[PDB]
Tab-separated table of C-alpha atoms in Angstrom:
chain	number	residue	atom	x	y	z
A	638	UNK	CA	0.000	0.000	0.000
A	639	UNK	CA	3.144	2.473	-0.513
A	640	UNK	CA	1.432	5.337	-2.538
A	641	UNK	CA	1.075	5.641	-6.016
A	642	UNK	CA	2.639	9.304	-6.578
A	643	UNK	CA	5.576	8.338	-3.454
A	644	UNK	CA	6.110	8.470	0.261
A	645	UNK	CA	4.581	6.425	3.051
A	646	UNK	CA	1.126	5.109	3.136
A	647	UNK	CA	-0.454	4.341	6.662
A	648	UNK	CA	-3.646	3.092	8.123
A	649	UNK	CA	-3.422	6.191	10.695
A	650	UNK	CA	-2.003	8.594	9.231
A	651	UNK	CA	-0.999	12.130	10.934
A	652	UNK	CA	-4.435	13.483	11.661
A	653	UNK	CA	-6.606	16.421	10.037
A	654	UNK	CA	-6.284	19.822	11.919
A	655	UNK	CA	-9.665	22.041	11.277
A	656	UNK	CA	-10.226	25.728	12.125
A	657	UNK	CA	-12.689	28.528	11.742
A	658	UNK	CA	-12.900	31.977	12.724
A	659	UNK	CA	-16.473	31.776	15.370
A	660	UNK	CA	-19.097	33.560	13.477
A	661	UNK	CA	-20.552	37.312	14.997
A	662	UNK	CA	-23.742	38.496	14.458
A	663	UNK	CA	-24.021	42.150	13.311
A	664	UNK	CA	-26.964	43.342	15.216
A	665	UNK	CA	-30.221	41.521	15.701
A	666	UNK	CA	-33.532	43.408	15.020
A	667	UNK	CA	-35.523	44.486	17.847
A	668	UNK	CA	-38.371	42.185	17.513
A	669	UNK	CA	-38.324	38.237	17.730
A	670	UNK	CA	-37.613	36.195	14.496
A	671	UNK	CA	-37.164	32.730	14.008
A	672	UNK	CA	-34.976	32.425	10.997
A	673	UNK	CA	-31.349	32.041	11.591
A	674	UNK	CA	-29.329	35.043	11.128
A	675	UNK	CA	-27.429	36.234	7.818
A	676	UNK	CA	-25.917	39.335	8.671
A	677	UNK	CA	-22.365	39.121	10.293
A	678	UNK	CA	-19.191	40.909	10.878
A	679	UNK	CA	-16.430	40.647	8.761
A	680	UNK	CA	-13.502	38.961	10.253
A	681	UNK	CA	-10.749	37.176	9.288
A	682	UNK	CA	-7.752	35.735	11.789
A	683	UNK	CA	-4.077	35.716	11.583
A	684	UNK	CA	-0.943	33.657	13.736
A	685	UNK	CA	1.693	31.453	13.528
A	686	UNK	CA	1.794	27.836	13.237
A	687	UNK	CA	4.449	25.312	14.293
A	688	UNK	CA	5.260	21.553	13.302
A	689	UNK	CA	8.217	19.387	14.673
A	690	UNK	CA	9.058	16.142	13.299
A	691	UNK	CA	11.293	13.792	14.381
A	692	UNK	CA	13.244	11.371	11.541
A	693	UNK	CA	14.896	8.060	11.695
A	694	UNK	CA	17.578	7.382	9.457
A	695	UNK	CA	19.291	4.687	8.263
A	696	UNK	CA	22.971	5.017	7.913
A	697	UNK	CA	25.292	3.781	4.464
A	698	UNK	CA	28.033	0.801	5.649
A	699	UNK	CA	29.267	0.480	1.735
A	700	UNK	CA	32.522	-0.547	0.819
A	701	UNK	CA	32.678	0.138	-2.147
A	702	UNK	CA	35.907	2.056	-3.428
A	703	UNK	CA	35.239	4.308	-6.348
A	704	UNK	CA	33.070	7.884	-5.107
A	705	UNK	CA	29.700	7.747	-5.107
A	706	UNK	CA	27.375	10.550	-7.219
A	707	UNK	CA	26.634	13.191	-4.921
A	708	UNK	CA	23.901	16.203	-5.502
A	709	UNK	CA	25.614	19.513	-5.740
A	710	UNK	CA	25.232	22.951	-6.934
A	711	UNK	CA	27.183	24.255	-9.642
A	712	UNK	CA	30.067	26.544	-9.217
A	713	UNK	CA	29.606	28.749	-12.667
A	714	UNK	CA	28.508	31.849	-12.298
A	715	UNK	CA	24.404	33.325	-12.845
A	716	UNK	CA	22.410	36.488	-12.185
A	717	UNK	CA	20.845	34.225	-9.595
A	718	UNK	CA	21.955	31.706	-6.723
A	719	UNK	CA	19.677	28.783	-6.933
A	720	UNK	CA	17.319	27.885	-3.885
A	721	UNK	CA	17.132	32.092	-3.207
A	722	UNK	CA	15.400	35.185	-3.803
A	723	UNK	CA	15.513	37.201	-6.437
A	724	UNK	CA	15.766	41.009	-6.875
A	725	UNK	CA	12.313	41.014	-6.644
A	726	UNK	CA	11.684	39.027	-3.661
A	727	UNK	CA	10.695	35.851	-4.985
A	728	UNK	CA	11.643	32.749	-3.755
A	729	UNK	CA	11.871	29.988	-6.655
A	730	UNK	CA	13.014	26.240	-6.579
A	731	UNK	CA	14.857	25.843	-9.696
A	732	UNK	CA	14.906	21.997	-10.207
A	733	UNK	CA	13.275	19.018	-8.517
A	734	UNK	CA	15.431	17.245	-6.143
A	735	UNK	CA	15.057	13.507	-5.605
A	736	UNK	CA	16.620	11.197	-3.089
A	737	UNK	CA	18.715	8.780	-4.776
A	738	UNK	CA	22.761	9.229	-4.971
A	739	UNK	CA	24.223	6.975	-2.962
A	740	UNK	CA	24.404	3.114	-4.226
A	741	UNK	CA	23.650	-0.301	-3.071
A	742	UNK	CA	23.592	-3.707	-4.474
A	743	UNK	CA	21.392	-6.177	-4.944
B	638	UNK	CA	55.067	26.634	10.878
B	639	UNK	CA	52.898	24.914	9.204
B	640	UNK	CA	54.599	23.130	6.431
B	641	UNK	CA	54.597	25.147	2.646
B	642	UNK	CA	53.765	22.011	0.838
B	643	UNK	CA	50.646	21.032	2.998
B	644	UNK	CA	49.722	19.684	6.325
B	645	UNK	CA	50.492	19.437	10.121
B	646	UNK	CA	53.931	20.946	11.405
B	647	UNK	CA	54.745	19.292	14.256
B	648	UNK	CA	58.193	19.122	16.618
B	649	UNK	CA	58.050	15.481	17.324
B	650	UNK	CA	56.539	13.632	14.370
B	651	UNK	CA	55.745	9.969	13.539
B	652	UNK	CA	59.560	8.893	14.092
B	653	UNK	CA	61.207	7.578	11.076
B	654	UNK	CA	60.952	3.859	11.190
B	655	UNK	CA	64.142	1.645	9.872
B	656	UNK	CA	64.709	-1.967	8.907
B	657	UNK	CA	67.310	-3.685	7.331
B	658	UNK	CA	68.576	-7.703	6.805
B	659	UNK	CA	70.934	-8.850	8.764
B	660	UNK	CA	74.028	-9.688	6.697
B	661	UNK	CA	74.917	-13.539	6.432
B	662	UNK	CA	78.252	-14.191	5.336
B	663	UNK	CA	79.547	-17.113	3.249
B	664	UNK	CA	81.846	-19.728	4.063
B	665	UNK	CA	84.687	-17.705	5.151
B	666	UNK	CA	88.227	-19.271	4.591
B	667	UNK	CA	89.889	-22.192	6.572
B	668	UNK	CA	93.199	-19.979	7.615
B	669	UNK	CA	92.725	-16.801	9.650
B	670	UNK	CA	92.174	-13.422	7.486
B	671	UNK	CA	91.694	-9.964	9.935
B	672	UNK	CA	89.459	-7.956	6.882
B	673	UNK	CA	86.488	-7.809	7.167
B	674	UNK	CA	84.212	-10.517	5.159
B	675	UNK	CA	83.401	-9.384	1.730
B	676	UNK	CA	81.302	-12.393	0.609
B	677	UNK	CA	77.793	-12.513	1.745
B	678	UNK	CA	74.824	-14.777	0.617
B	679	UNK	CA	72.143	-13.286	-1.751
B	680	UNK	CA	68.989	-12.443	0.540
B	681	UNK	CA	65.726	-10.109	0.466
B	682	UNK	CA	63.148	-10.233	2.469
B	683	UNK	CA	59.270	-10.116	2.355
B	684	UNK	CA	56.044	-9.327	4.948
B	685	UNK	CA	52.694	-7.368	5.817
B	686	UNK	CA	53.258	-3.682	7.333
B	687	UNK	CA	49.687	-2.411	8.886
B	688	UNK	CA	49.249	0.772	10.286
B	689	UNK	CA	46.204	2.578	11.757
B	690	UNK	CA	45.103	6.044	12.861
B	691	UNK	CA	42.453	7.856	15.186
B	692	UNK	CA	41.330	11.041	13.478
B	693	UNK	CA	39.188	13.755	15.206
B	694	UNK	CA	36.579	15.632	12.839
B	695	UNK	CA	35.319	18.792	13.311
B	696	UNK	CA	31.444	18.462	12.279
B	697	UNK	CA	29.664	21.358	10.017
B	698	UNK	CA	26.730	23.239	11.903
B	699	UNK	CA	26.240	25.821	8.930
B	700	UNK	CA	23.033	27.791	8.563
B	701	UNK	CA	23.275	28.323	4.918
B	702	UNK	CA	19.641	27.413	3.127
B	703	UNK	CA	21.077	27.179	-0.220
B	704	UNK	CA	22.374	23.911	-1.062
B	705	UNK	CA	26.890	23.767	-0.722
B	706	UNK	CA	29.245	22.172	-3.484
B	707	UNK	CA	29.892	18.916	-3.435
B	708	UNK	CA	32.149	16.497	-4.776
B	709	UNK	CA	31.456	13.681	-6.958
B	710	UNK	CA	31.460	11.509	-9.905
B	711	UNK	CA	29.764	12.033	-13.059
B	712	UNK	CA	27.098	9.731	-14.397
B	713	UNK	CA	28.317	10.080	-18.196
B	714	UNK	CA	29.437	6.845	-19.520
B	715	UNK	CA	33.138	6.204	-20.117
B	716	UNK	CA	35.411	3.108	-20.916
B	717	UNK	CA	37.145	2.653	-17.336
B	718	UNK	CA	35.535	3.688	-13.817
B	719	UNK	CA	37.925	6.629	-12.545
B	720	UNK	CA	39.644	5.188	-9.422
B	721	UNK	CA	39.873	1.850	-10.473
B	722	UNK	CA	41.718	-0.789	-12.434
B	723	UNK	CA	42.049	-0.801	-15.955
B	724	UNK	CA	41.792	-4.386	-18.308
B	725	UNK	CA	45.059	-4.511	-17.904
B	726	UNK	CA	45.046	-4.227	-13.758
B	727	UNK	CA	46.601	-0.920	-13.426
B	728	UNK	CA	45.485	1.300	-10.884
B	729	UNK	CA	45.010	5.176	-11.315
B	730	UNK	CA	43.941	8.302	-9.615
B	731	UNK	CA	42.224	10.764	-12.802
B	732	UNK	CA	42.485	13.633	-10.972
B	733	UNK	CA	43.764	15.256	-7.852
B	734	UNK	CA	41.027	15.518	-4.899
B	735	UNK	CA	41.595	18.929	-2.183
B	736	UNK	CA	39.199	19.206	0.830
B	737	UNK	CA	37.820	22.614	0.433
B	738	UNK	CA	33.555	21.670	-1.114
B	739	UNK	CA	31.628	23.088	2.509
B	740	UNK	CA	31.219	26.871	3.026
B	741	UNK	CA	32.111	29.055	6.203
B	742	UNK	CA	31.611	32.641	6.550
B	743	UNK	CA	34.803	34.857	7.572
């Protein structure tokens, strides 16, 4: 049951986290009515959010020789650094980035 | 003092370490001669050496969010694997290998 499009498939997986700003009334009329209210205050809500994960990993024991292919950045020179800002502000990730470098054998 | 060719400098290095075969003479003459013995049997000798060193490592705790240069091999297809034997069973470095891939700030 690994998923399709990558990564770890589980029968509990981390849970779903829902929020909602609590609806306010804007004010009632003066005299009783039954239907439920449709005018409110505009709100919205703002903060900061935190997550902490904790990874196992499994360290390489290889004996092989020769240097393995590592990932690296390029030393020759661009109007940008990759994995950065720009001039404008913008933050851009310039290639996709697997996880597969080192080797192993069968 | 560090030395101008590379390395650790130090006042009391690995010592030098020094072996030779003891000389074995041949049969030496039945009357007394007071020279010293110019005729020695043909001998070389032959054994394992092993040697093994403790290195301390000083560990990288950069906060750089771009990723750092790295070395390694390229996938590209050639006739030999570099650092390796050839068809013929000679061994070869391609290339020479320095230490300086990580970052620091000054």
């Amino acid at each position: 049951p690994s998923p399709l499009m990558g990564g770890f498939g589980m029968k509990h997986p981390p849970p779903q986290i829902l929020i909602k700003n609590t609806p306010v009334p804007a004010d009632p009329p003066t005299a009783f009515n039954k239907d439920k209210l449709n005018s409110f205050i505009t709100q919205y809500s703002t903060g900061q959010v935190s997550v902490e994960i904790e990874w196992e990993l499994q360290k390489e024991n290889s004996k092989r020789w020769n240097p393995e292919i590592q990932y690296t950045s390029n030393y020759y020179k661009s109007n940008n650094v990759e994995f950065a800002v720009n001039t404008e502000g913008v933050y851009s990730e310039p290639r996709p980035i697997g996880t597969r470098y080192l080797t192993r054998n069968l």
